[PDB]
Ligand SMILES: Cc1cc2nc3c(=O)[nH]c(=O)nc-3n(C[C@H](O)[C@H](O)[C@H](O)COP(=O)(O)OP(=O)(O)OC[C@H]3O[C@@H](n4cnc5c(N)ncnc54)[C@H](O)[C@@H]3O)c2cc1C
Ligand SMILES: Cc1cc2nc3c(=O)[nH]c(=O)nc-3n(C[C@H](O)[C@H](O)[C@H](O)COP(=O)(O)OP(=O)(O)OC[C@H]3O[C@@H](n4cnc5c(N)ncnc54)[C@H](O)[C@@H]3O)c2cc1C
């Protein structure tokens with residue numbers, strides 16, 4: 001069996017490794033347009049580790065073409081094209097193509113994040129623009145605040161990390177950052193950028209702002225030129241796959257940032273470019289290369305980070321995006337002093353559930369205490385179809401010096417349950 | 423005007439009271455307890471009488487229930503050596519763990535202390551004995567080591583926290599304590615205790631050990647003398663209940679420590695007097711006083727603690743516990759350095775070899791990863807397979823987690839390992 005994987009990153013390396021365990025005999029090739037793979041960027045595994053695991057790393061080769069019916073792909077190394085055949089093809093190409101509707105976005109003064117590899121332009125900057133307040137955006141605001149720069153943040157949605165939190169859950173986080181030369185512009189889109197000799201002017205749907213330079217923190221898209229046209233694609237240009245991560249054509253699969261994941265209990269498609277989706281989809285394709293053995297469970301955009309002094313975690317549907325779903329969403333917020341027997345710092349928890357079915361659909365957490373791991377529990381609760389009643393009584397552990405009497409996770413479900421009984 | 427009466431104003435009882443109020447804003451709710459005060463911890467106030475009072479919860483303290491009549495629905499208590507009767511529409515039994523019970527000869531010695539019932543007897547002792555290496559015993563040892571006493575630990579099972587960990591998982595914690603004058607006697611049961619003028623001698627299945635005093639760290643049982651003999655009970659004396667927490671008689675329910683809980687997947691009925699079992703059964707029973715609406719999920723004996731520099735957590739069946747079940751169980755150990763190069767996180771996963779259903783987990787590390795046990799517990803209690811655990815959602819962030827969560831990894835490792843075979 002010849003398993004060929006295009007993309008030697010999180011998704012691809014996971015698929016490679018997972019494939020090696022399933023098929024100890026199979027010939028496995030990992031292809032990538034880079035000099036070396038194995039490290040995080042802007043060193044979790046060594047080429048020797050892939051090698052010890054009988055995985056051929058064909059680097060410096062950029063895939064440029066495909067032939068689905070003859071089952072071949074073509075890469076271009078040292079100016080010379082070369083075709084390669086496959087029995088199974090796994091697309092783990094990620095998303096790095098910069099595609100915007102911003103006029104004059106090709107300014108060298110507008111840094112495109114992932115390509116980051118601090119930098120002269122930023123150090124010589126006093127005021128910097130950040131386009132996008134998603135996870136990538138907040139990371140940039142963080143490093144810019146450390147460098148003591150003035151920051152202008154542009155976000156089309158209502159609040160910071162909009163796809164993960166509802167306004168009230170991060171209102172304090174924003175104020176916190178506002179006291180640190182961070183200036184927010186929500187519900188404002190960057191329409192164009194004028195390059196001056198010593199800076200840039202962001203032309204938004206509301207005004208013009210001056211900055212010395214800018215960081216593009218919006219989600220990039222999959223560079224899928226090499227893609228065979230017979231392969232079904234989604235409107236947003238991601239590759240369409242079924243619950244087994246197979247493309248619309250025989251012997252070709254796609255994982256990670258290539259595809260659009262699904263939040264099943266609410267059967268809706270969305271693009272969640274996260275490391276956990278990359279690792280999970282990769283480990284799973286490996287068991288569906290010949291037979292539809294294990295359905296991908298889907299994604300809930302589960303995330304956890306730290307913005308300043310605040311630990312923030314999120315998973316599932318936000319109440320805000322509930323306007324676009326059939327479920328009648330309801331929510332409750334719980335405040336409970338941190339685990340040292342309710343004496344510690346406040347922990348804010350929001351739970352989103354279906355008001356009719358009482359199924360848990362989303363959760364948000366904000367605190368100065370690092371309780372982030374609880375998001376993995378809340379995520380599991382939603383992913384297994386629990387109701388307020390189930391969450392309310394799930395097992396949890398108590399220890400007078402380590403926890404509170406009743407876990408905030410269980411309490412979130414109970415509080416919602418009680419409120420639903422008037 | 424439903425009159426709900428709750429005997430026992432502790433974790434279980436107070437939870438039932440709170441929950442009963444939520445469900446019945448217009449109900450008469452009485453909380454009865456033989457103590458003077460309520461809402462204090464043990465082992466500094468988690469609820470004030472003023473609080474329960476504000477929720478219209480009739481606090482009837484200094485009253486000890488000594489009898490009840492199921493047929494006519496009444497209970498009787500002794501206040502100031504004068505009996506009194508009280509009626510109820512719904513009665514919730516939430517008394518706790520008090521009764522001292524053991525077949526040890528001479529256990530009546532005054533030199534053998536019962537944990538929970540700076541002590542003179544212990545400070546005058548240089549060598550103290552602890553009977554039981556369960557959670558209660560591990561705390562006594564902790565207390566004793568801090569007082570710099572020499573400790574002799576007796577445990578019928580194979581290792582410390584036997585109902586929570588298999589031998590290899592706590593081997594380093596044992597050595598850790600043995601450097602602090604703790605001497606362990608596993609697979610050794612105390613048969614009798616001889617009292618001397620200045621100490622005790624413990625007759626064991628293997629030898630005789632001298633100590634100045636001893637601590638009984640075995641689980642105490644519910645004081646159910648007042649119980650109407652009409653209520654069905656288990657062999658260990660706990661009160662039997664159906665999935666909705668009702669006893670075998672009309673309008674009487676039992677929760678917390680009076681009760682035995684279940685691990686449905688393996689059809690195991692056991693006694694696990696834990697605060698989490700007390701609180702959950704208390705909140706659930708309040709919804710089944712009339713119609714059976716919500717089945718109590720049961721318990722996995724989920725636990726988390728810290729011994730020395732070690733954080734230990736457990737949930738479900740240990741490999742050793744599994745040997746007691748017909749179903750064949752397997753396990754795998756996973757060592758993952760903590761995030762970002764950090765200290766080792768050691769986890770063991772127990773699963774059904776045939777169905778690949780996750781059934782138990784154990785964690786040990788110098789890193790506080792205990793919360794991960796709540797997640798593993800949810801995986802088991804929810805019926806996940808190794809495959810489900812392998813791909814469950816988890817969050818990643820370079821400064822806080824590893825690339826692939828150890829919880830997911832433990833499931834994947836078992837899956838892959840099973841594939842090799
Ligand atoms: C600044 C930033 C911060 C982020 N922070 C987080 C975070 O904190 N937590 C989190 O979960 N996620 C985070 N992400 C998202 C995460 O990095 C992605 O979800 C993840 O990289 C996806 O993995 P992948 O393997 O699918 O794609 P990639 O990691 O992009 O790998 C794809 C590989 O394919 C190769 N390739 C592409 N096209 C071709 C071709 N035509 N021919 C040959 N090879 C090709 C590339 O060289 C690349 O190595 C962040 C992203 C950015 C940009
Ligand atoms: C040393 C020690 C350490 C422990 N550590 C932990 C731990 O770390 N984590 C954990 O989860 N659990 C721990 N536990 C167990 C935990 O304390 C119990 O599971 C919990 O207290 C049970 O709650 P309950 O409300 O059912 O009973 P209890 O808390 O025992 O309360 C019963 C109440 O009923 C009253 N009562 C009894 N009889 C009568 C009567 N006849 N009439 C009127 N009132 C009566 C009593 O006054 C008492 O207040 C520990 C126990 C001990 C001894």
Ligand code: NA
Pocket residue numbers: 322323324325326327328329
């Ligand atoms: Na909706």
Ligand code: NA
Pocket residue numbers: 744745746747748749750751
């Ligand atoms: Na067995």
